[PDB]
Amino acid sequence: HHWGYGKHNGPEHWHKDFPIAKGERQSPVDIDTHTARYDPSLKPLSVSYDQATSLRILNNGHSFQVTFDDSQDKAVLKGGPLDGTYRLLQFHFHWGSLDGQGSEHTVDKKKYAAELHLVHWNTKYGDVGKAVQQPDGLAVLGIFLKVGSAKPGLQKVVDVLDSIKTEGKSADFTNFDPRGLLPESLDYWTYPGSLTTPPLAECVTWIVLKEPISVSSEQVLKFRKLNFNGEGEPEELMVDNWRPAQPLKNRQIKASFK
Ligand SMILES: C[C@]12CC[C@@H]3c4ccc(OS(N)(=O)=O)cc4CC[C@H]3[C@@H]1CCC2=O
Numbered sequence: 606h607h608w609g610y611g612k613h614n615g616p617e618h619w620h621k622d623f624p625i626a627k628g629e630r631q632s633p634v635d636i637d638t639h640t641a642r643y644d645p646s647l648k649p650l651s652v653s654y655d656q657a658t659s660l661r662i663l664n665n666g667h668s669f670q671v672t673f674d675d676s677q678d679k680a681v682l683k684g685g686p687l688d689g690t691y692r693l694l695q696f697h698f699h700w701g702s703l704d705g706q707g708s709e710h711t712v713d714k715k716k717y718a719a720e721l722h723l724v725h726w727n728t729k730y731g732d733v734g735k736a737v738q739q740p741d742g743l744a745v746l747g748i749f750l751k752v753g754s755a756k757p758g759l760q761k762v763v764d765v766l767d768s769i770k771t772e773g774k775s776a777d778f779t780n781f782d783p784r785g786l787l788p789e790s791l792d793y794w795t796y797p798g799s800l801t802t803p804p805l806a807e808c809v810t811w812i813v814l815k816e817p818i819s820v821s822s823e824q825v826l827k828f829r830k831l832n833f834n835g836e837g838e839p840e841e842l843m844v845d846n847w848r849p850a851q852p853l854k855n856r857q858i859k860a861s862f863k
């Protein structure tokens with residue numbers, strides 16, 4: 606019906622409404638670290654978030670997202686494999702019912718407990734709707750989460766999740782600094798791919814950081830208290846909101862690092 610992550614509407618069903626689900630550059634993928642080629646021509650990523658303006662936090666029935674003002678070049682991604690400048694629109698996460706699954710990308714088949722996606726769009730296309738119709742329209746920065754020590758910079762997010770438990774709910778979420786979610790290293794893998802939820806548009810340059818961040822069990826347990834459902838519907842925990850790895854097909858994953 607309306608798509609989701611369950612047995613009857615999950616990733617294996619998505620191709621019926623979105624036939625590009627079986628396309629040539631679908632995401633996520635398994636990153637086979639020994640086959641990825643070091644590309645010495647790849648530039649360091651430029652992550653310029655000093656002037657980021659967060660606006661809202663929202664439960665959309667498939668994840669939660671923190672939205673940013675993308676009406677000016679305040680929080681931008683450039684360099685790396687990218688041509689031009691990409692504005693930060695939002696970040697969100699994918700996570701599991703248990704710590705051994707939850708990431709969308711895998712690394713030598715290893716699944717992480719969660720994956721953070723910072724979604725940016727190419728300013729040459731003017732708006733994100735236009736950008737999703739272009740093969741170089743979006744750049745998504747992907748960061749793996751493992752469970753161990755807490756991530757202090759994530760705690761402001763975790764603490765408001767009680768206020769957006771169900772689909773439709775949102776809250777003010779100003780002055781959040783996404784730099785507190787980044788690992789030390791910007792070493793990355795990159796490949797051409799797609800959105801990982803409907804409409805699965807093949808518009809994304811994926812930039813996946815090698816270094817995970819650590820979050821605590823308590824932090825990830827708060828993700829797992831969210832609900833896919835609307836407030837007055839049967840409670841169905843928002844867990845396992847990840848798409849599995851898709852066929853690599855005629856693509857090469859490049860590494861920024863040796
Ligand atoms: C809202 C949206 C549909 C959903 C699109 C989407 C879907 C999944 C998504 O997640 S992921 N995992 O691919 O980063 C990011 C976005 C950003 C652009 C979003 C689109 C911009 C215009 C539009 O109609």
Ligand SMILES: [Zn+2]
Nearest residue numbers: 697699722801
């Ligand atoms: Zn995502």
